């Protein structure tokens, strides 16, 4: 299993599957096995990684799709990170 490491702006190291991170076109460009995000804090990057798992699991599925939770305190920063990463 191939993994990549995404480092937040506060030093937190998130290790995710390679195909999970390749769904973001921006991350795919910075990979071509480590990517540093000078602007994305850990409480935002952890939610981004949770979306990768949520997306891969629930795309093309007849099972009932659950709502992706986003706390209001992180909504603005996550939106800016989602805009930058295009996912």
């Amino acid at each position: 299993m191939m993994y990549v490491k995404l480092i937040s702006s506060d030093g937190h190291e998130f290790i995710v599957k390679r195909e999970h991170a390749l769904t973001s076109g921006t991350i795919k460009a910075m990979l071509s096995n480590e990517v540093n995000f000078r602007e994305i804090p850990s409480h935002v990057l952890s939610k981004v990684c949770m979306y990768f798992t949520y997306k891969v699991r629930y795309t093309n599925s007849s099972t009932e799709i659950p709502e992706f939770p986003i706390a209001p305190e992180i909504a603005l920063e996550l939106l800016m990170a989602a805009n930058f990463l295009d996912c």
Binding site: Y54, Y58, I65, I70, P72, L76, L79, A82, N83, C87
Partner: protein, 142 residues
């Protein structure tokens, strides 16, 4: 262009809301105009009478966010085999992380306060671009 056909052939269907949203069914009449119908609470079902060749789409009754019916955008009632009515599974789609964030931000700040948020002006324009049935209908016509 994108309208229901006046077939006069009845078709029974069950609108089943498998989503945490209040579902607004939308029927496109014979002139292509969208006609709203009574809303569906989350987890509830409604056995309704429609016709073959009619066009249906479903959306969040509160924010007009797009929804999926039978894993697609448009639901067309077909022929009833052995008297068994058709099932219309209304589910949440896998929103992009960007759009999902816009939904949450839209539900928290008033559209007059979109400018008061500290974001890139491109994101401000994305926030005001509310999901509209008329907008998606032009896009659905390829």
């Amino acid at each position: 262009v994108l309208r229901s056909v006046n077939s006069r052939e009845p078709s029974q269907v069950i609108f089943c809301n498998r989503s945490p949203r209040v579902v607004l069914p939308v029927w496109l009449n014979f002139d292509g105009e969208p006609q709203p119908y009574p809303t569906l609470p989350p987890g509830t079902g409604r056995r309704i009478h429609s016709y073959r060749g009619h066009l249906w789409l479903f959306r969040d009754a509160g924010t007009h966010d797009g929804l999926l019916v039978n894993q697609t955008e448009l639901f067309v009632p077909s022929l009833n085999v052995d008297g068994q009515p058709i099932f219309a599974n209304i589910t949440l789609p896998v929103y992009t992380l960007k759009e999902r964030c816009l939904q949450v931000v839209r539900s928290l700040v008033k559209p007059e306060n979109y400018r008061r948020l500290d974001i890139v002006r491109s994101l401000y324009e994305d926030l005001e671009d509310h999901p509209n049935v008329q907008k998606d209908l032009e896009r659905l016509t390829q």
